[PDB]
Write a protein that binds this DNA or RNA. Sequence first.
RNA 1: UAA
Lengths: 1236, 93, 392, 46
Amino acid sequence: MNVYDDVLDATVVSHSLATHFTTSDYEELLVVRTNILSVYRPTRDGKLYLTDEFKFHGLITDIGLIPQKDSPLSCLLLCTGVAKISILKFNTLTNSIDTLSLHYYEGKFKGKSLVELAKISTLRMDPGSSCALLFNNDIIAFLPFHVKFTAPSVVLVASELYEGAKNIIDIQFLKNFTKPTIALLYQPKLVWAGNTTISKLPTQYVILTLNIQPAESATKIESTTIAFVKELPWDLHTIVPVSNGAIIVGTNELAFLDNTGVLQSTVLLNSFADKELQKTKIINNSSLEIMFREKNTTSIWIPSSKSNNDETLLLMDLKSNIYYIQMEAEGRLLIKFDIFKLPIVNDLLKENSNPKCITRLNATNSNKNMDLFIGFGSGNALVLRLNNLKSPFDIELLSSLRNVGPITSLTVGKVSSIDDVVKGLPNPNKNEYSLVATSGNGSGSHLTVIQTSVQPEIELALKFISITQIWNLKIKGRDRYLITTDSTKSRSDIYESDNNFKLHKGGRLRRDATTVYISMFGEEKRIIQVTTNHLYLYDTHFRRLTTIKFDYEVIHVSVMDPYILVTVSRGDIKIFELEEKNKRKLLKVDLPEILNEMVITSGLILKSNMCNEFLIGLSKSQEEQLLFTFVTADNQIIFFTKDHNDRIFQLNGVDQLNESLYISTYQLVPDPSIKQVMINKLGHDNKEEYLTILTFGGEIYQYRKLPQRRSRFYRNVTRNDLAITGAPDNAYAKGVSSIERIMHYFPDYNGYSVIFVTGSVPYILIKEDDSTPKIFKFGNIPLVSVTPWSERSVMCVDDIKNARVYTLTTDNMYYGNKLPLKQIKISNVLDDYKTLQKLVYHERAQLFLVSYCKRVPYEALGEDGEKVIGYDENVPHAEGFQSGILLINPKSWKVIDKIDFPKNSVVNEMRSSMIQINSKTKRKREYIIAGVANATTEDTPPTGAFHIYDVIEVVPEPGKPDTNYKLKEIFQEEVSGTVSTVCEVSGRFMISQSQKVLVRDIQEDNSVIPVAFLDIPVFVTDSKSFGNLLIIGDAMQGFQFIGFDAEPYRMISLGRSMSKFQTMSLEFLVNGGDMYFAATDADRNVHVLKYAPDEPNSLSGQRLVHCSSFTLHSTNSCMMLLPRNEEFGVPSFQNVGGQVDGSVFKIVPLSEEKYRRLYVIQQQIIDRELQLGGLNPRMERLARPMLDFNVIRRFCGLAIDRRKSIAQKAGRHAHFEAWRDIINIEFSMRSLCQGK
Amino acid sequence: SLIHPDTAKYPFKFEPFLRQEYSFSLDPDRPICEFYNSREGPKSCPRGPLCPKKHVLPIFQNKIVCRHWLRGLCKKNDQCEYLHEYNLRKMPE
Amino acid sequence: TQRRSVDVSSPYINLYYNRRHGLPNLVVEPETSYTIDIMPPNAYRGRDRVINLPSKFTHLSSNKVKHVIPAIQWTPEGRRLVVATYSGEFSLWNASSFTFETLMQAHDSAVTTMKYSHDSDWMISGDADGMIKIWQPNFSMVKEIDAAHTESIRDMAFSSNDSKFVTCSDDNILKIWNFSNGKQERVLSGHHWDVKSCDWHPEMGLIASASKDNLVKLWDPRSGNCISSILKFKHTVLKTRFQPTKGNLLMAISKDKSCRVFDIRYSMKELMCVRDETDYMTLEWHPINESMFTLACYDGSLKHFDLLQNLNEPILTIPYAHDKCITSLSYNPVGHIFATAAKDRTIRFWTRARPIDPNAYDDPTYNNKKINGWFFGINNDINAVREKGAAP
Amino acid sequence: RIRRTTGIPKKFLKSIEMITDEGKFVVQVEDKQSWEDYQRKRENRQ
RNA sequence: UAA
Ligand SMILES: [Zn+2]
Ligand SMILES: [Zn+2]
């Protein structure tokens, strides 16, 4: 009974393509991160503007492009999981992706494989667009394409194409062939470093022309051996086809084989190359020590631009070094084959490592200038501009896609709210905790603060006495006359904001009644104030010029430059227009006749070009017309122009909140749900028109206007990018009960056009240029009124009459990825700490501790000091480890203390555990326990150490007040066996040694003695404790469940997992009175197991019951236990897990009834709704199931009637309770908003 | 506390089972039983196996750590006459 | 004292650091400093399975009393190797250091077979008198079946859930036992003459039996009737095994000098038919890498095979692996140590090859140059690679 | 031809009154207590 | 108090 949700979406870019997918007006950049396909429009200056994002239910293994007849757009080949192809097309009519066909190959692959399949299949596409092949391990799946869209597929072993093909290394389609010719790189006899002396030149290379004969039933393929090469170096791993041949990339060599099939030349890259073994052709010897040690080398082959002889190939190793390879062939023969390292003067590529894909953005018919998009596994994905590809080269950074790299550690601490007072007033996000993760893998490695809410910069704070709403007036582009009103007392003050908000006390403004609205008017020459029952027009000096009396009190009033819209309690509309000549007239505006015979819940004056098609002589993609927009009680959005004749338009489908909206004439059951709407521009640099809908239940719906065909608004339902803020059917009434939610638009917050939603829990709508708009929690205090302030600032008033000016922090913040992300650079230009890991937070001292891990060259030493025999000194060495501990003060994010561990030492685990230092008095102290494992070879005996640190307050060094804490080592000990994990149990700490776990306790005199002992099968991967219950992960045999006792110290073996898997992380999923465990596999599976001693076949609980398996889309690096926030309802907990792709997930345990309801809803969505890539979400996670909250979120995005019909499937009141527990899951992470 | 959630005294449904089997509980530092006697047997305690106190097995009254238990090769299990607890001062050198 | 230790703890540290950081397992280069980049055997699949080849002779062990060793068995976690002797004794040997001496005296007659439970909680051992003993992991005999078979027990294999286990003897029948009560369940009738070995399918209910009547039979444990017969062996069929992990394959050796691998998913389809001039005596599938197995011959000559590399010849032959006929093979469950026992009364341990090794594939196990004590320097060496094979 | 009680801890040996330790002959007996506990633990909720 |  669990539900899985993605706290963060993936950030590591794995694939990229340039094509015409959604439009042919420009070449888009398709970006795949883990399961999200992002379509970007690359600008001329390298900025990436997101067009639309699609989220899939499986891991996108590979992407490919195939053209289609009678269409300029190209279809998309999507590879998901293991051996699955879904052909994707973009439906321009529906602005969505519809799957052309599914192709399952895993079953055939297993049928034709003696050994287990590889986790990732590899897709190759014919340059002639005639066929595509997918191969896993010597089994090739061919997907022919007709020239009725896809011919039947044929799956065969590589031995059927060519007799000798036995261990395929790589397959590629060769170029300049009239038939779909492929090249196979294979090793009939497998050879590695320890096998080279007894096996010479094992790699082979064959060129096969394929004669695909599609038929109605099956496809027949015949391969003719064009050429065959028998003697090749063992380390060749990547085929890089070129115009006249193919470059074979190896760990130590670069072999060039032409399409004729003769190895014309080869380049030795390092000292490990096959020196004096090839000895049959041109041997370009290079002492550059270039190492392509990866399984597959990333590269881009740019064809010759028409031919200018400018065909370029760029290799790129794991350390982000771009290598230029030139092939100055005059024909079949090759001349001047060499590899050149591109000089990088400004080390802009230092922060990035493990490149994944390279794509050229803008062609410009010349290979001299190239704009390259490169995705990285650790650093930000970059858009680089290469200027002069020479054998003066210049490289500049145009833009970047934020990448939280591999989240290798997750902890909770205070990043904000350290100080309870900010500029006199209390901290707006006081007592708010945040997830802090470790990001990156090398020189560029930082702390990523996964903020639960937006932290605004305060530049002004003041206390008011009694207000309910405020307005700030800008007359000469400057702040004057900050009007405040008190609805309870019917008062209105002036508060001239030029000088310390002093009481102006001047002008005939109505001080003795509640102001409903006041703003500048008449091109900043008039001030209009709408009171409870009167409308007043003033000038800059607040002199009365016009007065209008309203019979009924006004409710909603909106103002544009020449017009004002007023709604009164009777429900009828009143629109006034200021006279242009000398103002002070306020003429009436004739409403449409049909308008007065229908109820309007809210209205506003709107400026947009959406209905320009229906207007007379206005069918231009410009000139936003003035529209008087109104929300009817039937939730219908209607609008008309000033010269409306009698025509009223309407957004169709908004009453049911349909996926697609469109403008049409409004021709004519009061169920008012839509509370406020507004259409405005959102974005940072390019502004996109969005329709934002506020419902009476507090939920916010966003519709994107299509830039082409502007009369239509579309909402992405597959993408779960918009956070849930409320529930329709009066569920979660506390979200809107205290403070009424008002949506305020600010075109310039810090250069961002944002939307502010007031209430007890405020929200801000921020849209990055490379991302969709996101709903972000704003602060941790209620917001009552927000007004623009100066330029690029706002003033916000909370519920306790405290007003403070805010500005959006944009220095290291990324307002995308479903949650605000703060980049904390720990390494500076002086001290370059390498990859940071094992980040902990010391609660008592309010400090963060992290461990750096510098990769140093490894020297293999024996047990005696003497070195191991086979050492070579004048040769590149494998990287060892060297680690230490950094004490970081979150006040300044500076390292205030550092301690270093010796060579060949990696801190495999660090904790901030509470340790019982006295068994009698039960005194507990928070110690930092670091588990150091000596990362060395298999032959040397395993060794390690554990250090216990106490954070002590010291006298700060003058100049730096934050250096008032230091690390004091109260105990350390070198122990036999690697210390792979550290965990605290019941006030005592347990560390893992080689096939051993020892429990020790600390006395008052800082004496540490082991008290318990338990044997471990192979290797401890993770260990967690729940009071006195242990779970110890094993690298081969799953995990086991241990209870710990004291007086008679015992390690009771309560149970263990029945299935043996290589677990990555462990955590407890308590789920009420029962007890479950979460175990992440090396196959990206997370398993839920329960301790069920009362079950029959559990052997008194010794056999853990396997509850569910759930295939995550990336490997899990870490898990943590977090308290769970209960919005309506014994403490409850949740699991938070960091992923390598940069995504954060959570498992929320559910009760039986909640699980039943949500399972029924999820099954209904899967069975009835149309999935994006045709992928069944149930089957994708199964490579009592764990529920995918991404599927359940589609319930929130359905139509109202569709929502009711789906909820009716099981439960009369299932809609209400379903919305309640969906809210509970969505807000389960808000326990960080209330702490200490 | 969000940093160190209170997971010590959690109400578990298998706690009575942990009392019956393994003589275990969720409070490692619970007071010793004033009625239970290891030599007399489980019947000495009036509250029976469901006693909130600690019922020390006779295996833990032994004076010297079992050398075969340390290697995981003790053939006598709880019937051994040597200590099956990782007590360092009680080891035979 | 300083000695040759083979521990996979540090390689696992490196592997999990790579996996938790998204770093790929970097290609090992022919240099000693790259031994740190050699991952634990469980981390290697596909073309990297060649790294998990035991080719470096690492240690040579022997009991105080030179007794014939009918069977050896690693503990299910690979911590220790159980060496059964012809005198009915159990000798343990720690995998960390290949060091232990204290005996157990398990049975009264020669222990012919041992087998641990898949749950790793129960070991059953059979002897030459037909007695079957059930052992706890701490080696505390808990149950005897005095007359499980009339003749000497030949082979015993547990079911997937370890609730049942099948045994065979010099009698012409196999009988399935209920482990919970130790009571015989049914008799697998057939197999004229004598049945020499048996094995249970790792996943589903399927029994393979090798017999002196030139037959390999497939049984249904639920019913106890033969479901298919293999007629492809021209003499008595010796030890037969399915596979440790998947069981899609089934291998049986016979003393007609032929080893055959069958695809059980395709009506016992023949995959490999490798013949040798010398007699095969035992086999051992690789515990991690499918399609990889080792054959032991009557003249020593460990022969490691690979279904995907060569269907006709071994991918690696260690011709003088043992001085006499090799009786039992046992891969460590972790997969980093390979243990072999022969009639020369010696236990020899094999580890994976090193990136660079002057004596690689030139040990006295590869060239018949075993002069007096040739393993003294290969068993007392603290390091592994060693300078360029011989010893005092 | 006659064995000695090497690893047997003298409590699973009863005097027969084929294997002997020091003089008087004994025989190994199953520890019919660990097997019984296994049986007890095989019971539901026990 | 040993196997
Ligand atoms: Zn008691
Ligand atoms: Zn003992």
